[PDB]
Design a protein around this nucleic acid. Structure first.
Lengths: 90, 100, 44, 70, 870, 69
RNA sequence: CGCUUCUCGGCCAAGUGUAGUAUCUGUUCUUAUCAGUUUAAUAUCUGAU
RNA sequence: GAUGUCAUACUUAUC
C-alpha cells in the first residue's frame, strides 16, 4: 500500500551550497541504499538536489523522514519527483 | 456530511446516549459540518451506541475524544429534532485511499 | 488584430462572432482555427 | 440549417383562424405574433378589444363567446 | 512496476541540465493489458469494423472496453468509464454486464485494487438496475460470498453493503429462493458464507421478514448440516444486529431452545454459540429468554466435557449478568470449580473462553475478594500469564480485559504486586501488555492502593520498558504518562532520575530514541508544575531550546510538541527560553514540508500570537503572515485550521490593515484548498476584530475582473456572516447590492456563493426585522432553483430553508404557490420538494397560510371552521 | 419515496389535489385540536362544549373532504 | 593563547486520490404519410408504403 | 440544441 505520488527519486530545495557530498550521502543513506545523488552546480538551480534510491519503500521512508530536516541556516524542503514540475524552466 | 453526497444517516429513535467526536473532527457539526457557534448536543440512538460502539465518532467512526454538538444554524432550522445523525454506511469515502 | 476577441468581467475571453467563451489564454488562440469560426467569418 | 429549425420548433405548420386562417411556422413565433399589430387589426374587425384574456384565442366563435361572457 | 531497476540513460533523461553527479496495443490508446488477463479482453485486440456485422453484444464488448479503462487504466479514464457505465446502466442491461463482470472478479490472478474497483462498479450499477438482477442474484452472491470472510475490514464492509443493496433491490422472495439450495451444500465454508449472506439479508430486510423461513429451516429434521447452517445464520444475525435482535429475542429463543438436544455435537455447539450471541444481543438482559435454555445448558456443562462444555460455560457467563442478583450468585457458586478445573486446558479456544467468562463471572456482588485472591487469582496468574498469549491480539486484549476486571473487582495493589515482575522481561509484546494493563489499572482504579515499597519498582519497570523499546508504538509513553498522572506528588524523588535518563537518551546515534525521549518529556510535562518543580522545567526548556538541531523531523516535531507543552504548563512571559529569543527562532522552522512538525510549528505560532503578542516589535508578524499563506494546501486537515486562527490573532494584535491585503492578494492562486483557507482566515480576522473595517475592502475584491477572486470574496463574506450570526444586522445593507449583483452573473458558482451568503444572512438575522432584504434576495434566488447542477440545487435548497425560517413559512408558501399543479414535471418535482421541505420545516404554520380552495361537486374543500366569525 | 412514507403529508410530483386537500384539512383539524384558542373559538361559536367539539373534530378526520376520485 | 585599534556582515519544484459541474476543439439527421411509448408543448424511438 | 473522444477551468473548511 503506497500512494502513486511517491517515487524512487526525491527533490530537495533550499539546500546549503557549502555542504559536501559525504554529508549528503550520510543524510540520504540513513533510510536505505541511495542509488544516485545529483547536486545543482548552476546559479539558477542552486540549493536544489535530486536523490534517487534503489528501493521504492526506502525512497518513501527517506522522503517521509527528510521534510524539514535540521541543516545549516536555510529552510530546506523535501518533495517527491515530478516530470511536469522538473521541466518547468524549459 | 455535506461534503460526501453518498453518506446516509441512521434516522432512528434518539435515546439518552450523547454523541462523541474524535480528535480529527472535534468541534465540527454533524449535518452542517461547522465549527462556529455550537448550540445543542447530538443525541445518538440505541443501536448506534451499544457495546463496542459506545463513545465512538459519529462522522468518521474512530475513538471519541470530545463531545459532539450541533451548530447554531441547525437548532434554529429544526435540524436537531430529527433522528440520530450517525453515519452507518461509508461509500466512496476513506475506502479507496487506504488500498492505494 | 482580431476584432472579435474581448475580455469579460470574470477574467476570461469572449468571441462575439461565434459567441463563445474561453477560460485560459491558450483556448482563445486555438478557437480562431476551426469550422465554426471559419463559418462565422464567411457568413459575416 | 435543419438543426436550428428542429431544435427551436420551426418548420411546424400552425393555423390561425382569427387573422384569415394564416400560417405560422412556430409556436413561439405565433405567441409573439399574437400580441402584435396584425392580430390586433384582425381582432378589431370582430369588435373584440385587445386584452390579455384573448391571447390564446384562435377561433372566431370562441373569441366571440369570450367577449360576450365578459 | 514501481520497484523495477532502471538504467543510467533513464535516470539521466529524467534530470534537467545544471546538475553534477556526486499486435499488442488494442485499438490504439488503451492501457497495457496483463498477459494473464488476455482472456476477458480478447475481443479488443482486433478492429471493430462496424459495417453490418455489429450485434448488440458487441456493444457489451464496449462495456468490456470501459472495463479496460476501469481495471488498469488512468484514474481520470477510470472516472470517465465509471460515469459512462453509471449513466448508461439501464440501456446496456444487467444481463451482459453481469456476464462480463462475473468471470473478471473470479480470476485467480486478480489483486486487491481490482477487486475493490469491481465491487465499486457493482455497487454503482446497483441503483439503476433495480428489480432486474433477480436471475443474476446467485451469480453476484457467489462472488460476494468470500468478500465477507476476508481479512480486511474495508472489503468486508463493502461486501456487506453490496449484500444489503442486493437484498434491498431483489426483495425478500428472490433472496430466499436463491439461498435455499445453498444451505445443504457439502462445502462448510460455502455454507457459512451463505449463512452470513442470509443473516445480512435478514438484517437489511427486517427480522420478521425472514423469521418464519429461518424457523422452518431450523425446525426441519432432515440433516444436521441444514440445522447447523441455520444456527450459524442465527448466531451471525445476533452478532450483527444487537439492538435489532433484542425484540426478536423471544422468537429467536424459541427456535434456539429446540437445538442442543440431538446426537450431533456440532449442532449443539452452534446452538450454544447462538444462545451466547443472543444473550449478548437479543434480550441482552433477558434471563427469561434463556429460562427454558438455562436448564439443558447446566446439564450439558456438568455431564460432558470438551468444546460443547466450553461453549455452555461461555453461554452461562454471557447470560449470568442478564439475570438477577440471586441467580448470578447461584450460578457463580457452581461455575467457579469448573473454571478452576479448566485452567490447565491445553486448547487455546477453551482457554480463551475461560478468560472471557472469568471477566463476566466476577463483575458484581456475590463473589468475595478474599476467595478470588486466594483460589482464583494464583491459577489465573500461573495458567494465563504466559509468553504465547501475548502473540495473538485476541488472546492479549481479552487477557488485559480480564486483568483489568480482576483489578477492579479484587484490588489494584494485588495486581500491581504481581504484574511488576514482568515489566523488565526480555519480550517486547509481554512488556507492552504489562504496561497497558498497568496503565488501565492506573486509569480505572488509580495509584492510591500502591504503597512506597512498590511505586519505585513500578517506576523502574516503566523506565526499563521505555528505555528498551524497539517499535514505534505510543503505548509505553501513554502508560508512563498515566502512571505519572496517577502518582502526582508521589513522584517527587523521581524527577532527577527521569531527567538524567531523558538527557542521556536525547543524545544518541539513533533517531527514534530522541523522539521517544521528547515524547516522554512532553507526556510528563504536566506533572512538574503540580509538584512545585520550576527549576527543572526551566532547565528542560533551556535544553529543548537548543535541541531543535535534530536532523530527524519526527524528533523535531516531538521536541516542538514538548516545547509547546512546557510553554502551556508554565507561564508565557516567565520562561527561561523566553518569547523574545524563540519566535524568531521558529520563523525558519515554520517552512518545513512535513505534516506533524509544521502543525506543531503552527500551533506554537498561534500560541505565541495569542499569549505573547507584546514580545515583538510589530515587524516579524508581518513577515510571518506572508509565510502563513504557504502553510495551507496540505493533506492533513490540522494546520489549515490553526493557520486561520494564527492569522486572526496576528490581525487582532498588529491591526487588521496588513493581513487583509495579503489575504486579498493570496486569493488569486487558481489552486484547490488555497482559496477557501485564505477566505476562512479573512472571515476569522473579520470576526475577531471589527467587521466594519474589513467591510469596504471585501467590496474591493469583487471590483477586480476575476471569477476566482470574486468567488473567494463571496465565500469569505458568507463565512464571515456565518461566524457573526446576530451581528450581521448592521452589515446587511452593505452586502445586499453585492448579493443582488452576484446572483445575476452567468457563472453558477458565483450564484451558489450568493445563495450561500443569503442563507447565512437569513440564518443569522432571523427574528430581527430584516425581512425586506430576505424578500429582495428571494426574488433573485427563485430562478436559481431550476439549475441542473446538484451543488447549485443544494445551495438553492439551503437558501430556501433559510428564507422559510427567516422571512416566515407564509412567504415560502406564497413563493412556491402555483407550482404544485404545474404542467412541466421538471419544475413540478422541484416545487413538490420545496413544499415538502417547507412542511418538514414548519407544518403548523401552513394552516393559516393555506390558500382558499373552492368546493367541487362530489368533494368539499372549503374550511368552514375558520371561515366562521363570532 | 421514503420521505412520503416516513412523514405523511409531504407529497410528490404525482400528488393529486384531493389528497393534498385532505392533508390540509387534517393539518387544520390537528391545529384546531392542539391550539386552545381555536378550540375556544369553536366552542364559543356553537353551543357545544370543548369535549363535543373535540369529538366532532376527531370523528371528521376520516375522509374530511369525502370519497376520493 | 591573552589585551588594544581599523573595516565588513546578522538580529532586536506545495504534490496525490475521491464526488459533481461550464466551454470550444474532431463529426451527424431537407424521409413524403399512418399507428403506438414518452414529452407542458418540441425532439427521439418502434412497425406498414 | 443533442450525441460521443480530448483539453481547460470551477465548487463542497473532502483526504
Amino acid at each position: 500500500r503506497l500512494p502513486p505520488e511517491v517515487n524512487r527519486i526525491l527533490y530537495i530545495r533550499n539546500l546549503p551550497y557549502k555542504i559536501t557530498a559525504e554529508e549528503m550521502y550520510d543524510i540520504f543513506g540513513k533510510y536505505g541504499p541511495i542509488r544516485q545523488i545529483r547536486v545543482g552546480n548552476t546559479p539558477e538551480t542552486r540549493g536544489t538536489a535530486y536523490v534517487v534510491y534503489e528501493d521504492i519503500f526506502d525512497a518513501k521512508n527517506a522522503c517521509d523522514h527528510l521534510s524539514g530536516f535540521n541543516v545549516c541556516n536555510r529552510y530546506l524542503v523535501v518533495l517527491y519527483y515530478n516530470a511536469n514540475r522538473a521541466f518547468q524552466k524549459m | 456530511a455535506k461534503h460526501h453526497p453518498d453518506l446516509i444517516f441512521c434516522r432512528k429513535q434518539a435515546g439518552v446516549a450523547i454523541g462523541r467526536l474524535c480528535e480529527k473532527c472535534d468541534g465540527k457539526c454533524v449535518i452542517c459540518d461547522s465549527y462556529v457557534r455550537p448550540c445543542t448536543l447530538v443525541r445518538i440512538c440505541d443501536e448506534c451506541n451499544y457495546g463496542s460502539y459506545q463513545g465512538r465518532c459519529v462522522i468518521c467512526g474512530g475513538p471519541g475524544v470530545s463531545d459532539a454538538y450541533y451548530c447554531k444554524e441547525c437548532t434554529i432550522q429544526e435540524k436537531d429534532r430529527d433522528g440520530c445523525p450517525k453515519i452507518v454506511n461509508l461509500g466512496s469515502s476513506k475506502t479507496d485511499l487506504f488500498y492505494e | 488584430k482580431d476584432p472579435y476577441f474581448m475580455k469579460n468581467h470574470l477574467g476570461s475571453y469572449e468571441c462575439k462572432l461565434c459567441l463563445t467563451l474561453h477560460n485560459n489564454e491558450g483556448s482563445y488562440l486555438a478557437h480562431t482555427q476551426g469550422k465554426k469560426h471559419q463559418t462565422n467569418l464567411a457568413r459575416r | 440549417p435543419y438543426w436550428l429549425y428542429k431544435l427551436h420548433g420551426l418548420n411546424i405548420n400552425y393555423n390561425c383562424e382569427i387573422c384569415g386562417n394564416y400560417t405560422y411556422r412556430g409556436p413561439k413565433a405565433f405567441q409573439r405574433h399574437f400580441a402584435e399589430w396584425r392580430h390586433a387589426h384582425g381582432m378589431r374587425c370582430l369588435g373584440i378589444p385587445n386584452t390579455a384574456h384573448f391571447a390564446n384565442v384562435t377561433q372566431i366563435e370562441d373569441a366571440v363567446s369570450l367577449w360576450a361572457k365578459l | 512496476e514501481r520497484n523495477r531497476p532502471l538504467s543510467d540513460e533513464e535516470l539521466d533523461a529524467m534530470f534537467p541540465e545544471g546538475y553534477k553527479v556526486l499486435n499488442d496495443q488494442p485499438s490504439g490508446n488503451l492501457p497495457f493489458l496483463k498477459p494473464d488477463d488476455i482472456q476477458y479482453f480478447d475481443k479488443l485486440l482486433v478492429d471493430v469494423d462496424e459495417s453490418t456485422l455489429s450485434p448488440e453484444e458487441q456493444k457489451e464488448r464496449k462495456i468490456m472496453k470501459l472495463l479496460l479503462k476501469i481495471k488498469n487504466g488512468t484514474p481520470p479514464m477510470r472516472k470517465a468509464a465509471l460515469r459512462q457505465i453509471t449513466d448508461k446502466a439501464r440501456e446496456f442491461g444487467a444481463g451482459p454486464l453481469f456476464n462480463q463482470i462475473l468471470p473478471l472478479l473470479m480470476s485467480p490472478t486478480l489483486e486487491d485494487q481490482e477487486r475493490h474497483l469491481l465491487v465499486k462498479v457493482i455497487d454503482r450499477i446497483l441503483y439503476k438496475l433495480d428489480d432486474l438482477v433477480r436471475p443474476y442474484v446467485h451469480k453476484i452472491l457467489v462472488v460476494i460470498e468470500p468478500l465477507l470472510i476476508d481479512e480486511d475490514y474495508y472489503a468486508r464492509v463493502e461486501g456487506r453493503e453490496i449484500i444489503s443493496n442486493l437484498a434491498k433491490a431483489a426483495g425478500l422472495a428472490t433472496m430466499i429462493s436463491t439461498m435455499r439450495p445453498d444451505i445443504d451444500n457439502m462445502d462448510e465454508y460455502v455454507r457459512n458464507t451463505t449463512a452470513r449472506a442470509f443473516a445480512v439479508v435478514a438484517s437489511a430486510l427486517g427480522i420478521p421478514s425472514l423469521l418464519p423461513f429461518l424457523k422452518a429451516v431450523c425446525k426441519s429434521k432432515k440433516s444436521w448440516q441444514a440445522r447447523h447452517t441455520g444456527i450459524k445464520i442465527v448466531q451471525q444475525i445476533a452478532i450483527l444486529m444487537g439492538c435489532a435482535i433484542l425484540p426478536h429475542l423471544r422468537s429467536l429463543v424459541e427456535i434456539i431452545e429446540h437445538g442442543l438436544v440431538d446426537e450431533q455435537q456440532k449442532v449443539r455447539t452452534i446452538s450454544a454459540l447462538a444462545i451466547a450471541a443472543l444473550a449478548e444481543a437479543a434480550t441482552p438482559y433477558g434471563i427469561e429468554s434463556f429460562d427454558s435454555v438455562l436448564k439443558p445448558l447446566w446439564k450439558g456443562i456438568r455431564q460432558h466435557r470438551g468444546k460443547g462444555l466450553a461453549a455452555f460455560l461461555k453461554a452461562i457467563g454471557y447470560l449470568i449478568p442478564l439475570m438477577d442478583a440471586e441467580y448470578a450468585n447461584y450460578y457463580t457458586r457452581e461455575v467457579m470449580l469448573i473454571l478452576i478445573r479448566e485452567f490447565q486446558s491445553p486448547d487455546e479456544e477453551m482457554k480463551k473462553i475461560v478468560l472471557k467468562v472469568v471477566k463476566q463471572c466476577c463483575g458484581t456482588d456475590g463473589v468475595e475478594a478474599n476467595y478470588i485472591k486466594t483460589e482464583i487469582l494464583p491459577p489465573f496468574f500461573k495458567h494465563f500469564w504466559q509468553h504465547r498469549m501475548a502473540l495473538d491480539r485476541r488472546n492479549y486484549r481479552q487477557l488485559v480485559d480480564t486483568t483489568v476486571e480482576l483489578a477492579n473487582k479484587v484490588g489494584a495493589a494485588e495486581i500491581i504486586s504481581r504484574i511488576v515482575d514482568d515489566l523488565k522481561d526480555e519480550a517486547e509484546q509481554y512488556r507492552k501488555m504489562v504496561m497497558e494493563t498497568i496503565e488501565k489499572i492506573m486509569g480505572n482504579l488509580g495509584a492510591a492502593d500502591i504503597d512506597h515499597k512498590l511505586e519505585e519498582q513500578l517506576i523502574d519497570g516503566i523506565l526499563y520498558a521505555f528505555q528498551e523499546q524497539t517499535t514505534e508504538d505510543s503505548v509505553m509513553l501513554n502508560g508512563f504518562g498515566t502512571v505519572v498522572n496517577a502518582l502526582g506528588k508521589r513522584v517527587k524523588p523521581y524527577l532527577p532520575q527521569i531527567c538524567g535518563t531523558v538527557l542521556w537518551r536525547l543524545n544518541n546515534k539513533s533517531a527514534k530514541v530522541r523522539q521517544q525521549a521528547a515524547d516522554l518529556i512532553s507526556r510528563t510535562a504536566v506533572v512538574m508544575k503540580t509538584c512545585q518543580e520550576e527549576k527543572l522545567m526551566g532547565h528542560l526548556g533551556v535544553v529543548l531550546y537548543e535541541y531543535l538541531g535534530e536532523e530527524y523531523p519526527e524528533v523535531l516535531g516531538s521536541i516542538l510538541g514538548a516545547l509547546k507543552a512546557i510553554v502551556n504548563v508554565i507561564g508565557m512571559h516567565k520562561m527561561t527560553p523566553p518569547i523574545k529569543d524563540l519566535l524568531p527562532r521558529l520563523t525558519p522552522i515554520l517552512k518545513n514540508r512535513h505534516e506533524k512538525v509544521q502543525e506543531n510549528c503552527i500551533d506554537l505560532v498561534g500560541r505565541i500570537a495569542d499569549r505573547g503578542a507584546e514580545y515583538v516589535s510589530a515587524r516579524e508578524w508581518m513577515r510571518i503572515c506572508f509565510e502563513l499563506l504557504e502553510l495551507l494546501k496540505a493533506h492533513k486537515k490540522a494546520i489549515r485550521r490553526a493557520t486561520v486562527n494564527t492569522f486572526g490573532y496576528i490581525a487582532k494584535a498588529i491591526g487588521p490593515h496588513d493581513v487583509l491585503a495579503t489575504l486579498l492578494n493570496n486569493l488569486k492562486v487558481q489552486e484547490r484548498q488555497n482559496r477557501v483557507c485564505t477566505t476562512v482566515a479573512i472571515a476569522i480576522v473579520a470576526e475577531t476584530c471589527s467587521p466594519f473595517t474589513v467591510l469596504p475592502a471585501l467590496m474591493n475584491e469583487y471590483r477586480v475582473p476575476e471569477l476566482n477572486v470574486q468567488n473567494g470574496v463571496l465565500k469569505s463574506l458568507s463565512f464571515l456572516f456565518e461566524y457573526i450570526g446576530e451581528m450581521g444586522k448592521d452589515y446587511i445593507y452593505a452586502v445586499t447590492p453585492l448579493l443582488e449583483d452576484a446572483l445575476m452573473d452567468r457563472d453558477l458558482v458565483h450564484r451558489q456563493t450568493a445563495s450561500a451568503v443569503v442563507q447565512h444572512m437569513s440564518l443569522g438575522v432571523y427574528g430581527f426585522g430584516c425581512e425586506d432584504s430576505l424578500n429582495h434576495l428571494l426574488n433573485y434566488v427563485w430562478p436559481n432553483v431550476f439549475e441542473t447542477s446538484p451543488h447549485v440545487i443544494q445551495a438553492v435548497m439551503g437558501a430556501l430553508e433559510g428564507l422559510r425560517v427567516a422571512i416566515g413559512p407564509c412567504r415560502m408558501l406564497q413563493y412556491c404557490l402555483q407550482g404544485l399543479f404545474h404542467p412541466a414535471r421538471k419544475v413540478r418535482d422541484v416545487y413538490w420538494k420545496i413544499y415538502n421541505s417547507i412542511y418538514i420545516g414548519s407544518q403548523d404554520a401552513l394552516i393559516a397560510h393555506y390558500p382558499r380552495i373552492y368546493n367541487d361537486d362530489k368533494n368539499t374543500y372549503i374550511r368552514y371552521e375558520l371561515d366562521y366569525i363570532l | 419515496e421514503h420521505l412520503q412514507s416516513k412523514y405523511i403529508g409531504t407529497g410528490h410530483a404525482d400528488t393529486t389535489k384531493w389528497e393534498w386537500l385532505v392533508n390540509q384539512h387534517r393539518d387544520s383539524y390537528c391545529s384546531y385540536m392542539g391550539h386552545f384558542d381555536l378550540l375556544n373559538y369553536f366552542a364559543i361559536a356553537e353551543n357545544e362544549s370543548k369535549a363535543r367539539v373535540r369529538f366532532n373534530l376527531m370523528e371528521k378526520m376520516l375522509q374530511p373532504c369525502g370519497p376520493p376520485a
